[PDB]
Ligand binder design. Structure first.
Ligand SMILES: O=C1C[C@@H](C(=O)O)NC(=O)N1
Ligand SMILES: [Zn+2]
Ligand SMILES: [Zn+2]
Ligand SMILES: [Zn+2]
Ligand SMILES: [Zn+2]
Length: 362
């Protein structure tokens, strides 16, 4: 007997197109999404070229429309040059992404004043999300308060961070956050097995106490999001390993296992992979869209999942219970038992749907 879930939403994926298509492209990354029970993704802007200007966004939109198999929205990225220039295209994006820790030269902000300028110029009704670790959480929260608006914190990974956000919520501040599965299901205890290259990720893997704190503070976590960050094994195992894990194909099975064990409820999962993504990012419903899962099937994660071009996974060897059997997307069968059945280009930019515009005052 299968359980019918709504179309799940992953608000944090790296699909690598343009410019990194040996790691993933829209077609392979959205195949991975569908096989993970995800019907809508929000793609990050740290591509090559990065999505930091209108021409780059226009290119990425066409590449996504041609390659995506599930629906999507595309983030814009903040740069040291683009504050006050994105007003005409801002509403067509998922939101604005700020990379506030170590990043590329194109996305690097060298001063908190540049963060302020983005918060002051980006349209006030549109989402802002930040890669903000440790004290950077507190710093970006201060900028948000100075500019009188909300912020969403990506991939919270530490006891320190979740407790800070908890304290901010207790003071009524408009902050939301997401957590990635590797910060719930892996820790320092796994670094020996992974090795130093595969184990590289930002935020880094936490201690057992960090992991425990995230679970104990589940009420503070608004969303789950994979931070699907595919790189090839050659890259992960080479001399300058890039940080990141693929995660679209493993996120839902890992979380269903936890539901099975009573660590969180099915509702808790659906708030965090459906309702709260919708409401924080003002993402539209997908008509005639659902995911059927088998909660009884026990399996072991293999050395690579079928679809991501990363062709490796840090969750190899973990025992999970729960699997995606079928996905229907806008009335068409998109996935059954390991076969993706919608072509590249089936997916659409949800920000172009009438119901997908973010409401604003005239
Ligand atoms: O901040 C980031 C970016 C990401 C990537 O590979 O794009 N991978 C990571 O581990 N953290
Ligand atoms: Zn990040
Ligand atoms: Zn995020
Ligand atoms: Zn990311
Ligand atoms: Zn519901």
């Amino acid at each position: 007997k299968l359980v019918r879930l709504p179309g799940l939403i992953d608000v944090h994926v790296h699909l690598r197109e343009p410019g990194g298509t040996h790691k993933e492209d829209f077609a392979s990354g959205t195949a991975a999404a569908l096989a993970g029970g995800i019907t809508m993704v929000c793609a990050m802007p740290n591509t090559r070229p990065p999505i930091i200007d209108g021409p780059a966004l226009a290119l990425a939109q066409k590449l996504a429309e041609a390659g995506a198999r599930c629906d999507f929205a595309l983030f814009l990225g903040a740069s040291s040059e683009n504050a006050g220039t994105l007003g005409t295209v801002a509403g067509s994006a998922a939101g604005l992404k700020l990379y506030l820790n170590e990043t590329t030269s194109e996305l690097r902000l060298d001063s908190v004043v540049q963060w302020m300028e983005h918060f002051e110029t980006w349209p006030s009704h549109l989402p802002i999300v930040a890669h903000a670790e440790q004290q950077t959480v507190a710093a970006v929260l201060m900028v948000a308060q100075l500019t009188q608006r909300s912020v969403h914190i990506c991939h919270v990974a530490r006891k320190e961070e979740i407790l800070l956000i908890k304290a901010a919520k207790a003071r009524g501040l408009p902050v939301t956050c997401e957590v990635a599965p590797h910060h719930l299901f892996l820790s320092h205890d796994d670094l020996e097995r992974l090795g130093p290259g595969k184990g590289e990720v930002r935020p880094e893997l936490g201690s057992r106490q960090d992991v425990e704190a995230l679970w104990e503070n589940m009420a503070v976590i608004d969303c789950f999001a994979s931070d699907h960050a595919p790189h090839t094994l050659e890259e992960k195992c080479g001399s300058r390993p890039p940080p990141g894990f693929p995660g679209l194909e493993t996120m839902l099975p890992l979380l269903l296992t936890a539901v099975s064990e009573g660590r969180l409820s099915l509702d808790d999962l659906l708030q965090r992979l459906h309702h709260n993504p919708r409401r924080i990012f003002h993402l539209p419903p997908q008509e005639d869209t659902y995911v059927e899962v088998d909660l009884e099937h026990e399996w072991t994660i293999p050395s690579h999942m079928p679809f991501s071009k990363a062709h490796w996974t840090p969750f190899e060897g973990q025992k999970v219970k729960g699997t995606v059997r079928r996905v229907v997307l806008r009335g068409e069968v998109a996935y059954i038992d390991g076969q993706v059945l919608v072509p590249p280009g089936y997916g659409q930019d949800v920000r172009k749907w009438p119901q997908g515009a973010v409401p604003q005052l005239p």
